[PDB]
Symmetry: C3
C-alpha cells in the first residue's frame, strides 16, 4: 500500500462557516457547500496549514484545533482575541512537528494522530452552540511512512446523534471487501458513548494498526469516548468476516435504541451484499 | 505456570437460553442450569467454536460475540436474519486467528483478548431487554504461550448492579494467597462505571500482565468502563498486601453507595482470613 | 534534567484532617494548614511511607491510597478496622516495589505512576461525604531514572468542580516557558469528565512522556476520566506554541459552561504574557 512521504510543506486552505437548513451550521470548502462534519483536513508531520476562515454566520465564530501546534493567536477563543466577526476573515495557522530528541536528551513526541477542529465561540465561550449545530470536523496527521487508506469515514457522536442525524438518516459507509478503510471517531457535547463495529476490530494504539510482534496494546472492538475525545484506526473491510450490512453504533443501550446506529456496508467487488 | 498451547481445534458447544426466577434470563450449558453471567467460553487463537443455541425463552433471542471472526449469518441480529425462535435451534460459528503478516506486508492483529457474548434481540433490536435480564457472558481467547490462571472471576457491571445483584448479594470471589487470579470485567446497559480493586493492580495492556522491561503501559487499579467494554487481567492474590477482605467495587460514589460492591476474599492456605 | 535515584528509604509523614471554612475538610501537613487538594506525596519505587494520621474532624475518617502496597490494616475502611476516631491518631503504612521477575519467571510490574489518596469513611462507608468536602490528594511514585519536573500542578475533577472551586475561582497555574511542568489529574464523585489543555499534548503511557522510537501509545490532548481515575504527564510549557493564557478545562460542554475551567498561564522569562 501507499505510505506517507516526508512532511514539511506549507499548505493553504479556505474554510467557509455557513448556515445550513434547520438552524444548523457547518464548515465548507466553497460557499454554499458546508457539510456536517466539516471537510477532513489531512497533513503529514512537519506540514504547516494556513487556513483562511470566512465567517458567513450571523454570530462571531472561531476555529480551534486539537493536537497541533498553534500559538494563542490561533487559539480560537475570545479570551485570546481569536474569533471571526460576521462577514470578516481570519487566517488560523496550524504547525506540526515530527518526533525527535531535545537538547536535554528527552523525546518530543510528534504531532501524528487522529484529531479534530470545531468552533469555540458560538453560543458560549466554549463553542457549545456552534458544536451543537454542526461546527466540527476531522483532522488526520500522518507520520512519515504511515499506511494510507482507500476510504475515510468520519463518525462524530454529537450528543444523541451521529453527525447530527439519528433515526435511519445516519450515514451509510460503503466499501468493497478487501479495501483499506480508515475510521475517524470524534465525540462532542454532553454525553459519553461507546463506539462499536460489528465484524471488525482494531489495535488501541496511535494508528489502530498492529505495529509489530512486540506491540502490546489491547485489541478491541468497543471504545468509551467522551466529548472531544478523538481516535482512529484502519481495517481491511470484510477481513475474516465477509461482505454484509455491518452495524456501527453506540453501544449504550438507550442510545442505540434512540437511533445512534448506522451501517458499514461491505460489498463484493460487483456490488452485491448479503441481506 | 501453565501456558496456552498452539490453537487450531474445532470445538462444539451447546448453550441453552432459559428463563430464570423473577423475570430474568440466562445462558446455560444444560437445560435448567443457566447462570448470570453465562458460562465462560475459553479458546486459543486459531480455534473455531460451533455453538448450537437452544432458545427456551418465549421470545426470539440471539447470540452476538465481540472480538471474534464471524460472518453475517452469525451476526446475532434480526437485520442479518440471525435470531432463534422460541423452541428452535441455531448454530453460531466463531472463528479466531493468530497475528500474522498480510501479503501487503502489514500486520494483522490476532483475536486474543478478553471479550464477551450477549443477546442482541430480546426487547429491542439491540438486545436491551435481553441484556437487562441477564443474557450475557464472558469469552477468553488466549494467545499461544499466554500464562494461565488458577481462578477466573467475572464481574459484569450491568446498569447499577454487579452480575444483576446489588446489596450484600453481589458475588464474593475466594482465592488462596499466591494463586494466579484472572478477572474479566464487562459493562452493559446505560451507564459508565469505574472498576477498582483494593490491594491489587494491573497493567493496562492486552493481558493485564507486564510484558517486559520495555512495556510502557500504565499500571492502574481503577478503569473507566462503558456499556460493552471488556478487559481483563491477572494478579497474584495477596501479592505485597496479604490475605484479607479486599473490596472490589464501582468507584462512582453514588454507585458504590447503592451496592455496586463486593468482596475479593484472599485467604491463607488453611482458610483463615483477617477480619 | 534531574532523574530519580534508586529508592528504598523509609520516610515518615504526618497528615492532619482539619475542618476548613464552609463545611469543607482537608488534609494538611501542619494543624491549621489543610489544603484542597491535600499535600502531594512523592516517593520512589521501593520507598516506604509511615504516615501518622491525626483526625481533627468531628467524625471517624480515614486514609486510603490507590496503587501502592498496603495490608488490610492500612485499607482505610471500617470493614477492615482501619479508621481514625475524632481526636485520635493512627499510622498508615504504604510500601512500594520496583518491577522484577518472580520465581515463576513472570514479570511483576512496579508501583511507579500517578496515584492518589482520599478518605474512605466520612458520610458513607465509601467516603462519599469526605471526598465531596475535599478529603483527597495526589501521590507520585517515581521509577528510578524518571525525569523530574520543575513544577507540579494538581487538577482534581470533583463532581462539577476543579479542586472544589468553579467560577473564576479555579486555580491558575503559572510557569515560565520552557519549564518542565507535570500535571496530575484525578477524578472524584459521581460524574465522568474529559480533561483537555489548549496548546499542549502528551503520550498516553505511564509517564506521559514518549519513551522512545518504538513507543506506540496514542498522543492526545483530551482524556476521559471517571471517579478515582488518576493519570499524569509532563510537558515543556509553551513548547511549539509560546507563552500565553492556555485554558485547561473539562471538555464536556455543559460542564465547562458551568465553570469547569481554569488557566495554565505560561509566561516569558520576565513575567510577560500575551493577553
Ligand atoms: Cu477549550
Ligand atoms: Cu451513546
Ligand atoms: Cu475542543
Ligand atoms: Cu450491535
Ligand atoms: Cu458504577
Ligand atoms: Cu454487543
Ligand atoms: Cu473502596
Ligand atoms: Cu466534566
Ligand atoms: Cu479510592
Amino acid at each position: 500500500p501507499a505510505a506517507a512521504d516526508k512532511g514539511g510543506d506549507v499548505r493553504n486552505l479556505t474554510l467557509y462557516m455557513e448556515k445550513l437548513p434547520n438552524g444548523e451550521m457547518g464548515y465548507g470548502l466553497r460557499p454554499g457547500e458546508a457539510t456536517i462534519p466539516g471537510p477532513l483536513i489531512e497533513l503529514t508531520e512537519g506540514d504547516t496549514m494556513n487556513i483562511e476562515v470566512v465567517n458567513n454566520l450571523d454570530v462571531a465564530a472561531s476555529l480551534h484545533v486539537h493536537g497541533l501546534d498553534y500559538d494563542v493567536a490561533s487559539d480560537g477563543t475570545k479570551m485570546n482575541d481569536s474569533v471571526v466577526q460576521p462577514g470578516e476573515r481570519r487566517t488560523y495557522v496550524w504547525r506540526t512537528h515530527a518526533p525527535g530528541k531535545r537538547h536535554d536528551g528527552t523525546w518530543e513526541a510528534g504531532s501524528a494522530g487522529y484529531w479534530h477542529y470545531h468552533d469555540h465561540n458560538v453560543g458560549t465561550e466554549h463553542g457549545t452552540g456552534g458544536i451543537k449545530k454542526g461546527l466540527y470536523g476531522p483532522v488526520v496527521v500522518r507520520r512519515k511512512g504511515d499506511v494510507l487508506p482507500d476510504k475515510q469515514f468520519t463518525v462524530v457522536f454529537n450528543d444523541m446523534t451521529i453527525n447530527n442525524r439519528t433515526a435511519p438518516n445516519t450515514p451509510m459507509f460503503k466499501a468493497v471487501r478487501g479495501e483499506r478503510v480508515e475510521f475517524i471517531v470524534i465525540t462532542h457535547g454532553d454525553f459519553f458513548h461507546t463506539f462499536h463495529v460489528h465484524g471488525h476490530r482494531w489495535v488501541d494504539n496511535r494508528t489502530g494498526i498492529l505495529e509489530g510482534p512486540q506491540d502490546v496494546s489491547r485489541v478491541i472492538d468497543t471504545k468509551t469516548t467522551g466529548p472531544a475525545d478523538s481516535f482512529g484506526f484502519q481495517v481491511i473491510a470484510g477481513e475474516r468476516v465477509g461482505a454484509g450490512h455491518w452495524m456501527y453504533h453506540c453501544h449504550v443501550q438507550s442510545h442505540s435504541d434512540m437511533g445512534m446506529s448506522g451501517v458499514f456496508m461491505v460489498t463484493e467487488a460487483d456490488g452485491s451484499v448479503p441481506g
